[PDB]
Amino acid sequence: MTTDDLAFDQRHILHPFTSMTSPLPVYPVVSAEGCELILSDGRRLVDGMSSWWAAIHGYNHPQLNAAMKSQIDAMSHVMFGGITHAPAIELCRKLVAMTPQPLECVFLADSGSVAVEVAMKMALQYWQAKGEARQRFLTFRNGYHGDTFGAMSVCDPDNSMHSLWKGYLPENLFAPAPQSRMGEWDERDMVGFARLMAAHRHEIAAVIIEPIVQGAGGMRMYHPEWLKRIRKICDREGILLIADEIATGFGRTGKLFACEHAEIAPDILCLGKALTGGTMTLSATLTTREVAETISNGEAGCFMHGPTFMGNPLACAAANASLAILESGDWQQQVADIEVQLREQLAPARDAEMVADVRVLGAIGVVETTHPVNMAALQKFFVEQGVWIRPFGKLIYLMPPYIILPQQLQRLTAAVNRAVQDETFFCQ
Amino acid sequence: MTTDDLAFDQRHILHPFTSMTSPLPVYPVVSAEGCELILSDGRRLVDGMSSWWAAIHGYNHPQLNAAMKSQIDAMSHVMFGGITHAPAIELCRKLVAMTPQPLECVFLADSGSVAVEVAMKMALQYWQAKGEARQRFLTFRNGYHGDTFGAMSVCDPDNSMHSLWKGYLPENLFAPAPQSRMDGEWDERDMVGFARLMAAHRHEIAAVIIEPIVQGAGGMRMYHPEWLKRIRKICDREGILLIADEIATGFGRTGKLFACEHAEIAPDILCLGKALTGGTMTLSATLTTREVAETISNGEAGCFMHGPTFMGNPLACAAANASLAILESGDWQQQVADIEVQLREQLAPARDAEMVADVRVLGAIGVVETTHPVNMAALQKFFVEQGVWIRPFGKLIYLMPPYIILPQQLQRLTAAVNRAVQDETFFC
Ligand code: NA
Ligand code: NA
């Protein structure tokens, strides 16, 4: 990559949630291997982010690579309308088997946001078929479910800046963010959620939440008793429960799916990110026979959705290989050890002036700061320390690949602790 | 693939817009090469569909394969937050250069529907930044723009069954479907409906969104280019943004590189997908102007508020680059022109068949509209038996073959279509 390549990127290529008028520096990556990213200048960075949850097995994984190349040799893509193929069948077999018993019907899609849209549409079509006027969703404040319009309608109105779209987005119900920490249960935490359910139980199509960990909305970690109760309340009212595990799925919190922390099963489950081992985009929405059949027996005679690249053989083959790595069970002890090391190594941030809170769960470590980070200065600092850590707002957090070496994880935690010692890298 | 595999697929795997209770047969594909799909059982089928537009270069293309394998060796994926890479830069360079001059800022995404959502959000954020209360979209009937909530809100209300979501979807403006034909003559009576809507709703319209020249999923309609000229001028005069959805028409399918070229106009926002990667895997792009991109970044949010996890996916970008490189030869023009002449000549006899209502051809798109709905299971079996993969829908039996299709292969397709419509056997 030439300097001119970088200049073109700056003036012509949009990046996630960042200004085109006041763009901040981006770092050119040429390749990646193991748990490291390699910059154009040759510098190697220990990846602390897993490219946002997904790369649970790191980069250039020989098994993932071989499975992808082998599927390319057969066919990278063929349409799924009137056609099926081995990669999709193998993936759906695994997904059905590894999730709770009732979840046995799979709708594959391309991205997390679309998977949520699918889940929401399932809930709406389900009630339409039953002849019930139910079009509201009940969710938690500080939640995040994606950027398409349906998903946006259940995201935190504040974090997701709903004022920008006031009048376009449907108005859903937002219960207070769960207070009880992943800590002791306080029954008073339920008063808000209960109030909403009482006033709106008749019109709620589904409850949608991120189980245990609220990611993009604040990297919050709450008590599993919340899920147990929500499941009981939904059962009681006949309301569908949608669990968005696009971030928590596939071992990240210490259990295969975060719903396990409460031994609960949702009616609808959304999966993405780590599904393919972070090699390429793919998502899945699973639901029950009751939901799937009810929908097909309604007026449309089917579930009204079908993306062009649905069931993409290549992505399915990548996901199959990624799931096969997890089948060994090694991730269990890898995450447990990462959790101990995160707890042990981030503890000192509790003595730092710029820190508001420290919390760890599984292979997730979060240092919340008192002031917003200076994105440009702090990103450069991390790069200079030989690590790739991507902060945002008042959060400096780590979600490393499960295969990360202890000395690599240590470089990450040391960098985090050094960043929070004084006001140098803060505000802007 | 065993019969047990096929049973599992039927019981547990949803497919595009089809029942989970009364599913029709799906054919197992094991591989694909050139212009052929290879069924598990060994039968080879000439592909007439390009897996829904996308596979313009066919299957197992050497250049696409090589580019994909090479990228896997470097990195299949890395996050785009704070990072850039060669595949993304090379792809965006190509997209900026090949599209009209004003289109110089690129937002990469995962799927066509997401690209449309991005375009819609760009329009909404644009006006919000300018302090204008514009939230409505003006579109045309028989339009199709994707399956997510925003996209659905601009799809034809009859075809997409908007009654399922009445009360959830925002209510947009729908001008009559364009009547003047691409083969035929311009009738100024065509404009009254659109003019009436614009005059009455000008001040609240954020953007006009249309599929240029060909309305795909909404009826495989082919309308006169004067429409686009007129719309562009009206938008220019009223200060309204024009979104061209070229997710199906892009990259040469209608005889020109982009269908907008037929009217020699450029939109403010351009959506691309399907054939972008040569139909190897999912990827999309939304291009806009500097005026739009900068205005949004100068507003409240300080940026365009979108950023999918797999944004800029290196692997998909490498595939798209290889696909565009093939198109750079200019060869597609002659290929598409030849396909067009053969389609016109060989579908012509179908105009005399009792079961045919209309025959229309444009570029590498050949359509035979019938008087009655086709019998999906029976007609699909017929086509497979003739050694062709043609996927009909409703009253439409259409062809959109890979540009590399041989004349003999194309003849098998047209022969099969003509035979399918000579009597009512495969109808109702
Ligand atoms: Na299951
Ligand atoms: Na351009």
Short mmCIF file of N, CA, C and O in Angstrom, two decimals, chain B residues 66-161:
data_model
loop_
_atom_site.label_atom_id
_atom_site.label_comp_id
_atom_site.label_asym_id
_atom_site.label_seq_id
_atom_site.Cartn_x
_atom_site.Cartn_y
_atom_site.Cartn_z
N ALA B 66 -8.57 -17.91 -7.80
CA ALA B 66 -7.19 -17.55 -7.49
C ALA B 66 -7.14 -16.35 -6.56
O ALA B 66 -6.40 -16.35 -5.57
N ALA B 67 -7.93 -15.32 -6.86
CA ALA B 67 -7.96 -14.12 -6.02
C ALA B 67 -8.44 -14.44 -4.61
O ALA B 67 -7.89 -13.91 -3.64
N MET B 68 -9.45 -15.30 -4.48
CA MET B 68 -9.98 -15.67 -3.17
C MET B 68 -8.97 -16.46 -2.33
O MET B 68 -8.79 -16.17 -1.14
N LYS B 69 -8.33 -17.46 -2.93
CA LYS B 69 -7.32 -18.27 -2.24
C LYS B 69 -6.12 -17.43 -1.81
O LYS B 69 -5.61 -17.61 -0.72
N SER B 70 -5.67 -16.53 -2.68
CA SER B 70 -4.56 -15.65 -2.34
C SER B 70 -4.93 -14.76 -1.14
O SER B 70 -4.12 -14.56 -0.23
N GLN B 71 -6.15 -14.22 -1.12
CA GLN B 71 -6.56 -13.36 0.00
C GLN B 71 -6.64 -14.15 1.30
O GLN B 71 -6.28 -13.64 2.34
N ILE B 72 -7.12 -15.39 1.23
CA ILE B 72 -7.19 -16.24 2.43
C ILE B 72 -5.79 -16.40 3.05
O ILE B 72 -5.63 -16.37 4.28
N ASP B 73 -4.79 -16.53 2.20
CA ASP B 73 -3.39 -16.67 2.62
C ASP B 73 -2.88 -15.43 3.36
O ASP B 73 -2.04 -15.55 4.26
N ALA B 74 -3.38 -14.26 2.99
CA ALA B 74 -3.03 -13.01 3.66
C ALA B 74 -3.87 -12.84 4.92
O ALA B 74 -3.36 -12.83 6.04
N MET B 75 -5.18 -12.70 4.73
CA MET B 75 -6.14 -12.62 5.81
C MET B 75 -7.55 -12.65 5.22
O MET B 75 -7.86 -11.85 4.35
N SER B 76 -8.38 -13.59 5.69
CA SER B 76 -9.77 -13.70 5.24
C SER B 76 -10.53 -12.48 5.72
O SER B 76 -11.32 -11.89 4.97
N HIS B 77 -10.27 -12.09 6.97
CA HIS B 77 -10.94 -10.96 7.56
C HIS B 77 -10.13 -10.26 8.66
O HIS B 77 -9.36 -10.88 9.39
N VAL B 78 -10.33 -8.95 8.75
CA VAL B 78 -9.85 -8.13 9.86
C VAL B 78 -10.88 -6.99 9.99
O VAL B 78 -11.50 -6.61 8.99
N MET B 79 -11.08 -6.47 11.19
CA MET B 79 -12.03 -5.37 11.38
C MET B 79 -11.62 -4.12 10.59
O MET B 79 -10.44 -3.90 10.33
N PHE B 80 -12.60 -3.28 10.26
CA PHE B 80 -12.38 -2.07 9.48
C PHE B 80 -12.39 -0.83 10.38
O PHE B 80 -12.26 0.30 9.90
N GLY B 81 -12.57 -1.03 11.68
CA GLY B 81 -12.56 0.08 12.63
C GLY B 81 -11.15 0.50 12.98
O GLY B 81 -10.47 -0.20 13.73
N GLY B 82 -10.68 1.62 12.43
CA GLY B 82 -9.33 2.10 12.68
C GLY B 82 -8.28 1.45 11.79
O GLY B 82 -7.08 1.70 11.92
N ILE B 83 -8.75 0.61 10.87
CA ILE B 83 -7.88 -0.18 10.01
C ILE B 83 -8.34 -0.09 8.56
O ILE B 83 -9.54 0.00 8.28
N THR B 84 -7.40 -0.11 7.63
CA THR B 84 -7.74 -0.24 6.23
C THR B 84 -6.83 -1.32 5.63
O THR B 84 -5.90 -1.81 6.29
N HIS B 85 -7.13 -1.73 4.40
CA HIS B 85 -6.37 -2.79 3.75
C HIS B 85 -6.50 -2.68 2.23
O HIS B 85 -7.35 -1.95 1.72
N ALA B 86 -5.63 -3.40 1.53
CA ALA B 86 -5.52 -3.30 0.07
C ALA B 86 -6.78 -3.72 -0.70
O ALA B 86 -7.18 -3.02 -1.62
N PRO B 87 -7.38 -4.85 -0.36
CA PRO B 87 -8.62 -5.25 -1.05
C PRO B 87 -9.69 -4.16 -1.00
O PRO B 87 -10.31 -3.88 -2.02
N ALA B 88 -9.92 -3.57 0.17
CA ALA B 88 -10.92 -2.51 0.27
C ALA B 88 -10.52 -1.30 -0.57
O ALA B 88 -11.34 -0.75 -1.30
N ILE B 89 -9.27 -0.87 -0.49
CA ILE B 89 -8.85 0.29 -1.28
C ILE B 89 -8.95 0.03 -2.79
O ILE B 89 -9.51 0.84 -3.54
N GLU B 90 -8.44 -1.11 -3.24
CA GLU B 90 -8.51 -1.44 -4.67
C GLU B 90 -9.96 -1.48 -5.16
O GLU B 90 -10.29 -0.96 -6.24
N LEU B 91 -10.84 -2.08 -4.36
CA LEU B 91 -12.25 -2.20 -4.75
C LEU B 91 -12.91 -0.82 -4.84
O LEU B 91 -13.61 -0.53 -5.80
N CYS B 92 -12.70 0.00 -3.82
CA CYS B 92 -13.30 1.34 -3.80
C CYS B 92 -12.74 2.21 -4.92
O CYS B 92 -13.46 3.04 -5.47
N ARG B 93 -11.47 2.04 -5.26
CA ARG B 93 -10.90 2.79 -6.38
C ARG B 93 -11.68 2.48 -7.66
O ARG B 93 -12.07 3.39 -8.41
N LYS B 94 -11.92 1.19 -7.88
CA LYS B 94 -12.62 0.71 -9.07
C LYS B 94 -14.06 1.21 -9.12
O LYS B 94 -14.52 1.65 -10.17
N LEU B 95 -14.76 1.13 -7.99
CA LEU B 95 -16.15 1.58 -7.93
C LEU B 95 -16.27 3.08 -8.16
O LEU B 95 -17.17 3.53 -8.86
N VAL B 96 -15.37 3.85 -7.57
CA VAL B 96 -15.42 5.29 -7.76
C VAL B 96 -15.17 5.63 -9.23
O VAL B 96 -15.87 6.45 -9.82
N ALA B 97 -14.18 4.98 -9.83
CA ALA B 97 -13.81 5.31 -11.21
C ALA B 97 -14.85 4.89 -12.26
O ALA B 97 -15.04 5.60 -13.25
N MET B 98 -15.52 3.77 -12.03
CA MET B 98 -16.47 3.24 -13.01
C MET B 98 -17.87 3.84 -12.94
O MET B 98 -18.66 3.70 -13.88
N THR B 99 -18.18 4.50 -11.84
CA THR B 99 -19.47 5.15 -11.68
C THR B 99 -19.35 6.62 -12.03
O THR B 99 -18.25 7.19 -12.04
N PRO B 100 -20.48 7.25 -12.33
CA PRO B 100 -20.50 8.69 -12.60
C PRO B 100 -19.63 9.51 -11.67
O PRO B 100 -19.45 9.21 -10.49
N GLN B 101 -19.09 10.58 -12.23
CA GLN B 101 -18.15 11.44 -11.53
C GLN B 101 -18.51 11.86 -10.10
O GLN B 101 -17.66 11.83 -9.20
N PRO B 102 -19.74 12.30 -9.87
CA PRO B 102 -20.14 12.74 -8.53
C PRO B 102 -20.09 11.66 -7.46
O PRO B 102 -19.96 12.01 -6.28
N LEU B 103 -20.19 10.40 -7.85
CA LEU B 103 -20.21 9.28 -6.91
C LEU B 103 -18.78 8.92 -6.54
O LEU B 103 -18.13 8.16 -7.24
N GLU B 104 -18.30 9.48 -5.43
CA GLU B 104 -16.90 9.32 -5.06
C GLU B 104 -16.64 8.90 -3.61
O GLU B 104 -15.48 8.80 -3.22
N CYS B 105 -17.69 8.68 -2.82
CA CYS B 105 -17.54 8.20 -1.44
C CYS B 105 -18.24 6.85 -1.29
O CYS B 105 -19.40 6.71 -1.66
N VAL B 106 -17.55 5.88 -0.72
CA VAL B 106 -18.08 4.52 -0.70
C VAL B 106 -18.30 3.97 0.71
O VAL B 106 -17.39 4.02 1.54
N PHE B 107 -19.49 3.43 0.95
CA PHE B 107 -19.79 2.73 2.20
C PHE B 107 -19.99 1.25 1.85
O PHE B 107 -20.98 0.89 1.23
N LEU B 108 -19.06 0.40 2.26
CA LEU B 108 -19.17 -1.03 1.99
C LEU B 108 -20.04 -1.69 3.05
O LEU B 108 -20.00 -1.31 4.20
N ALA B 109 -20.83 -2.68 2.65
CA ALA B 109 -21.68 -3.39 3.60
C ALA B 109 -21.79 -4.87 3.23
O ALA B 109 -21.05 -5.33 2.34
N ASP B 110 -22.69 -5.60 3.89
CA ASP B 110 -22.75 -7.07 3.76
C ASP B 110 -23.75 -7.61 2.73
O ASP B 110 -23.48 -8.63 2.09
N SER B 111 -24.90 -6.96 2.57
CA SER B 111 -25.97 -7.44 1.69
C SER B 111 -26.70 -6.28 1.01
O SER B 111 -26.56 -5.14 1.43
N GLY B 112 -27.46 -6.59 -0.05
CA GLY B 112 -28.22 -5.60 -0.80
C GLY B 112 -29.22 -4.84 0.06
O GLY B 112 -29.29 -3.63 0.04
N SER B 113 -29.99 -5.56 0.86
CA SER B 113 -30.92 -4.92 1.74
C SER B 113 -30.25 -3.92 2.71
O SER B 113 -30.75 -2.85 2.96
N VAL B 114 -29.10 -4.30 3.27
CA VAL B 114 -28.37 -3.42 4.16
C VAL B 114 -27.88 -2.18 3.39
O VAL B 114 -27.88 -1.08 3.93
N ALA B 115 -27.48 -2.37 2.13
CA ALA B 115 -27.02 -1.26 1.30
C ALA B 115 -28.16 -0.25 1.10
O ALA B 115 -27.95 0.97 1.10
N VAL B 116 -29.37 -0.77 0.92
CA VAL B 116 -30.55 0.06 0.76
C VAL B 116 -30.84 0.81 2.07
O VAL B 116 -31.11 2.00 2.05
N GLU B 117 -30.76 0.11 3.20
CA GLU B 117 -30.94 0.73 4.52
C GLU B 117 -29.92 1.87 4.73
O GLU B 117 -30.24 2.92 5.29
N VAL B 118 -28.70 1.63 4.29
CA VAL B 118 -27.64 2.62 4.38
C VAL B 118 -28.02 3.85 3.55
O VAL B 118 -27.94 4.99 4.03
N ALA B 119 -28.46 3.61 2.32
CA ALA B 119 -28.87 4.69 1.42
C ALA B 119 -30.01 5.51 2.06
O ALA B 119 -29.99 6.73 2.04
N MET B 120 -30.99 4.82 2.61
CA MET B 120 -32.12 5.49 3.24
C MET B 120 -31.69 6.32 4.44
O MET B 120 -32.11 7.47 4.59
N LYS B 121 -30.85 5.74 5.30
CA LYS B 121 -30.27 6.45 6.44
C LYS B 121 -29.43 7.65 6.00
O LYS B 121 -29.45 8.69 6.66
N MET B 122 -28.68 7.50 4.91
CA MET B 122 -27.90 8.60 4.39
C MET B 122 -28.84 9.76 4.05
O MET B 122 -28.57 10.90 4.39
N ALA B 123 -29.96 9.46 3.40
CA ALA B 123 -30.93 10.49 3.02
C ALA B 123 -31.53 11.17 4.24
O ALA B 123 -31.63 12.40 4.29
N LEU B 124 -31.93 10.37 5.23
CA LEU B 124 -32.52 10.89 6.45
C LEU B 124 -31.52 11.74 7.26
O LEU B 124 -31.85 12.83 7.72
N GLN B 125 -30.30 11.24 7.42
CA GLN B 125 -29.29 11.99 8.18
C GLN B 125 -28.89 13.27 7.46
O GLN B 125 -28.56 14.28 8.10
N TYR B 126 -28.90 13.22 6.13
CA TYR B 126 -28.56 14.37 5.29
C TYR B 126 -29.50 15.54 5.61
O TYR B 126 -29.04 16.65 5.91
N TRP B 127 -30.80 15.27 5.57
CA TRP B 127 -31.79 16.32 5.81
C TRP B 127 -31.84 16.74 7.26
O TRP B 127 -32.04 17.93 7.57
N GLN B 128 -31.61 15.80 8.17
CA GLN B 128 -31.58 16.14 9.58
C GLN B 128 -30.46 17.16 9.80
O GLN B 128 -30.64 18.16 10.49
N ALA B 129 -29.30 16.91 9.19
CA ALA B 129 -28.17 17.83 9.32
C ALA B 129 -28.47 19.21 8.74
O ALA B 129 -27.95 20.22 9.22
N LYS B 130 -29.30 19.25 7.70
CA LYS B 130 -29.64 20.52 7.05
C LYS B 130 -30.80 21.25 7.73
O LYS B 130 -31.16 22.35 7.32
N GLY B 131 -31.36 20.64 8.77
CA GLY B 131 -32.45 21.23 9.53
C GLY B 131 -33.79 21.17 8.82
O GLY B 131 -34.68 21.97 9.12
N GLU B 132 -33.96 20.24 7.89
CA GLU B 132 -35.21 20.13 7.16
C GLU B 132 -35.99 18.88 7.56
O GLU B 132 -35.42 17.79 7.68
N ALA B 133 -37.30 19.04 7.77
CA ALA B 133 -38.17 17.94 8.15
C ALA B 133 -38.58 17.10 6.94
O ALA B 133 -39.70 17.23 6.43
N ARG B 134 -37.66 16.25 6.48
CA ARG B 134 -37.92 15.36 5.35
C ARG B 134 -37.69 13.90 5.76
O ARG B 134 -36.55 13.48 5.95
N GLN B 135 -38.76 13.12 5.89
CA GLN B 135 -38.66 11.71 6.30
C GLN B 135 -39.34 10.73 5.36
O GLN B 135 -39.29 9.53 5.57
N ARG B 136 -39.99 11.23 4.33
CA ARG B 136 -40.72 10.33 3.45
C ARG B 136 -39.92 9.97 2.21
O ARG B 136 -39.03 10.71 1.79
N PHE B 137 -40.23 8.81 1.66
CA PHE B 137 -39.61 8.35 0.43
C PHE B 137 -40.66 8.22 -0.66
O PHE B 137 -41.76 7.76 -0.41
N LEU B 138 -40.31 8.65 -1.87
CA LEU B 138 -41.20 8.50 -3.01
C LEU B 138 -40.63 7.39 -3.87
O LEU B 138 -39.48 7.45 -4.29
N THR B 139 -41.44 6.37 -4.12
CA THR B 139 -40.98 5.25 -4.89
C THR B 139 -42.07 4.87 -5.86
O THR B 139 -43.10 5.54 -5.98
N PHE B 140 -41.86 3.78 -6.56
CA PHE B 140 -42.81 3.42 -7.56
C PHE B 140 -43.42 2.07 -7.21
O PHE B 140 -42.78 1.24 -6.57
N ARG B 141 -44.64 1.81 -7.68
CA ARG B 141 -45.23 0.50 -7.44
C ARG B 141 -44.45 -0.54 -8.24
O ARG B 141 -43.78 -0.20 -9.22
N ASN B 142 -44.51 -1.80 -7.79
CA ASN B 142 -43.82 -2.92 -8.43
C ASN B 142 -42.31 -2.89 -8.16
O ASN B 142 -41.54 -3.64 -8.77
N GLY B 143 -41.91 -2.03 -7.23
CA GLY B 143 -40.52 -1.93 -6.84
C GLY B 143 -40.18 -2.95 -5.78
O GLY B 143 -41.05 -3.40 -5.02
N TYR B 144 -38.91 -3.32 -5.74
CA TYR B 144 -38.40 -4.24 -4.72
C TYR B 144 -37.01 -3.79 -4.31
O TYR B 144 -36.15 -3.61 -5.18
N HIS B 145 -36.78 -3.67 -3.01
CA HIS B 145 -35.52 -3.13 -2.51
C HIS B 145 -34.88 -3.91 -1.36
O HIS B 145 -33.91 -3.45 -0.79
N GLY B 146 -35.43 -5.08 -1.04
CA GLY B 146 -34.89 -5.87 0.06
C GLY B 146 -35.92 -6.25 1.11
O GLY B 146 -37.05 -5.74 1.08
N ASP B 147 -35.51 -7.11 2.05
CA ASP B 147 -36.41 -7.72 3.04
C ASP B 147 -36.32 -7.14 4.50
O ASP B 147 -37.14 -7.48 5.35
N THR B 148 -35.35 -6.27 4.78
CA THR B 148 -35.28 -5.64 6.11
C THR B 148 -36.34 -4.54 6.19
O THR B 148 -36.88 -4.10 5.16
N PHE B 149 -36.64 -4.07 7.40
CA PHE B 149 -37.75 -3.14 7.62
C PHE B 149 -37.73 -1.87 6.77
O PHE B 149 -38.74 -1.52 6.16
N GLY B 150 -36.59 -1.18 6.72
CA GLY B 150 -36.48 0.02 5.90
C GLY B 150 -36.73 -0.27 4.42
O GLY B 150 -37.50 0.44 3.75
N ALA B 151 -36.07 -1.32 3.92
CA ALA B 151 -36.21 -1.74 2.53
C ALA B 151 -37.64 -2.12 2.23
O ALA B 151 -38.20 -1.71 1.21
N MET B 152 -38.24 -2.91 3.12
CA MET B 152 -39.63 -3.32 2.94
C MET B 152 -40.55 -2.11 2.80
O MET B 152 -41.53 -2.16 2.05
N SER B 153 -40.25 -1.03 3.52
CA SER B 153 -41.10 0.16 3.51
C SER B 153 -41.16 0.85 2.16
O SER B 153 -42.02 1.72 1.95
N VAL B 154 -40.27 0.49 1.24
CA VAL B 154 -40.30 1.07 -0.11
C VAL B 154 -40.55 0.01 -1.18
O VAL B 154 -40.43 0.29 -2.38
N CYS B 155 -40.91 -1.20 -0.76
CA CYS B 155 -41.29 -2.26 -1.70
C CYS B 155 -42.77 -2.11 -2.01
O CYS B 155 -43.52 -1.57 -1.21
N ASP B 156 -43.20 -2.62 -3.17
CA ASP B 156 -44.61 -2.55 -3.53
C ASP B 156 -45.48 -3.16 -2.43
O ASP B 156 -45.26 -4.30 -2.02
N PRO B 157 -46.47 -2.42 -1.95
CA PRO B 157 -47.34 -2.90 -0.86
C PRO B 157 -48.16 -4.16 -1.18
O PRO B 157 -48.40 -4.94 -0.26
N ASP B 158 -48.58 -4.34 -2.43
CA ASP B 158 -49.35 -5.53 -2.82
C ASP B 158 -48.47 -6.77 -2.91
O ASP B 158 -48.76 -7.80 -2.29
N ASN B 159 -47.37 -6.67 -3.66
CA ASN B 159 -46.46 -7.79 -3.86
C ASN B 159 -45.78 -8.28 -2.59
O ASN B 159 -45.60 -9.49 -2.40
N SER B 160 -45.41 -7.35 -1.72
CA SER B 160 -44.69 -7.66 -0.48
C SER B 160 -45.64 -7.88 0.69
O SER B 160 -45.19 -8.07 1.82
N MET B 161 -46.94 -7.82 0.43
CA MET B 161 -47.91 -8.14 1.46
C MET B 161 -47.73 -7.21 2.67
O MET B 161 -47.54 -7.68 3.80
#
